[PDB]
Amino acid sequence: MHLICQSGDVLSARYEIVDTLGEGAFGKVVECIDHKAGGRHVAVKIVKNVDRYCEAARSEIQVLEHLNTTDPNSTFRCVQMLEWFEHHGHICIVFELLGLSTYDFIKENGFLPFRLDHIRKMAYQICKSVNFLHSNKLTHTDLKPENILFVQSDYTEAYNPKIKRDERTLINPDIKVVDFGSATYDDEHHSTLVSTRHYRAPEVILALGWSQPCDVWSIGCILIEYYLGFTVFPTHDSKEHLAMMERILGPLPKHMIQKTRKRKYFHHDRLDWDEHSSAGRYVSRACKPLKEFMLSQDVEHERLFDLIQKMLEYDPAKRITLREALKHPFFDLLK
Numbered sequence: 291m292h293l294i295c296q297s298g299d300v301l302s303a304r305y306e307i308v309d310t311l312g313e314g315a316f317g318k319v320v321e322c323i324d325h326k327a328g329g330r331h332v333a334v335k336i337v338k339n340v341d342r343y344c345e346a347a348r349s350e351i352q353v354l355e356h357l358n359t360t361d362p363n364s365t366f367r368c369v370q371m372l373e374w375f376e377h378h379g380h381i382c383i384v385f386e387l388l389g390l391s392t393y394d395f396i397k398e399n400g401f402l403p404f405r406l407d408h409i410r411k412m413a414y415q416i417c418k419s420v421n422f423l424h425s426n427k428l429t430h431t432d433l434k435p436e437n438i439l440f441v442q443s444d445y446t447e448a449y450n451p452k453i454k455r456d457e458r459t460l461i462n463p464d465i466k467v468v469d470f471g472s473a474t475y476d477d478e479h480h481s482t483l484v485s486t487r488h489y490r491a492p493e494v495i496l497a498l499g500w501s502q503p504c505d506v507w508s509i510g511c512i513l514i515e516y517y518l519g520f521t522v523f524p525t526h527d528s529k530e531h532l533a534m535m536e537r538i539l540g541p542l543p544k545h546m547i548q549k550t551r552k553r554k555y556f557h558h559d560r561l562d563w564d565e566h567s568s569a570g571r572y573v574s575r576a577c578k579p580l581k582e583f584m585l586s587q588d589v590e591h592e593r594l595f596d597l598i599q600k601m602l603e604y605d606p607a608k609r610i611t612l613r614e615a616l617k618h619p620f621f622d623l624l625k
């Protein structure tokens with residue numbers, strides 16, 4: 291991979307790499323000048339030459355052809371694929387060039403949260419985009435701030451020598467959704483593990499089956515993050531994650547606890563969790579009932595938190611849908 295991305299390299303005798311934009315499990319994404327479209331800059335995703343990532347990338351191309359055909363204007367804000375090719379046996383998918391990921395924008399600002407007026411506009415566009423997937427018998431399964439990109443470099447930035455970095459101020463918060471390598475059709479085989487730990491729904495953790503509602507959970511976690519500047523589930527352990535859920539959202543529904551085949555996590559009908567261990571006191575300390583994360587009691591803030599709370603319903607059958615979410619009072623201001 292290192293051997294076929296470098297600045298100056300030309301892919302498919304037209305795409306000149308000028309920069310690396312990002313990396314994930316799949317491989318890398320680079321910025322290219324397209325010398326055969328008048329020098330337009332594009333994003334090219336170069337996939338690892340590994341079976342599971344090759345298959346995920348053919349899956350992604352297939353989803354993109356479907357979404358881009360269904361929604362040619364990108365009204366529902368799924369990234370447009372321009373084409374795909376093979377480069378030294380790696381699949382390369384060419385995209386319209388977007389701007390920063392919401393992850394990178396927040397991280398590089400020192401994990402400062404987005405303005406509430408921006409979160410409103412971004413939440414709406416994310417729900418509108420993922421609900422278009424939901425309407426078309428798809429679940430994304432891997433919604434996270436890294437997979438939400440600003441459309442434009444509609445921001446300013448100045449070097450602040452006090453904190454020795456650039457601060458980026460957002461002008462227009464318009465986003466698109468990316469990465470359809472995990473996106474699963476209703477009728478296809480559902481992977482057991484989906485989503486990256488922090489944005490994974492309880493039905494996924496407990497292996498109870500999943501579909502569209504697990505996207506809604508993920509979006510709930512994103513909105514939290516946008517508001518605070520960090521996750522409420524900062525963990526790398528499934529049981530601790532569940533312990534964190536219990537502290538933030540209250541006890542798991544007995545019916546999910548009792549139904550799960552992931553019984554290692556439990557003892558009779560409670561999380562097998564030592565609250566009085568130093569790991570348990572860590573969770574109690576770091577985690578609090580959701581509403582206590584609110585930075586203002588202002589109604590606008592209550593409206594967002596009420597949507598977040600419905601998005602983080604434990605029971606996927608009770609969880610708000612995005613169709614419902616798009617009608618929530620938090621978005622009334624947009625209309």
Ligand SMILES: CN1CCN(C(=O)C(C)(C)c2ccc(C(=O)Nc3cn4cc(-c5ccncc5)ccc4n3)cc2)CC1
Binds near residue numbers: 311312319442470
């Ligand atoms: C590192 N430097 C940071 C500083 N820079 C910038 O502030 C500009 C505005 C010039 C810039 C920033 C980011 C991108 C970008 O990252 N754009 C992109 C990724 N990207 C990623 C998929 C994608 C993913 C995952 N799966 C499928 C597709 C799609 C489109 C796409 N566009 C562009 C310009 C220059 C770059």
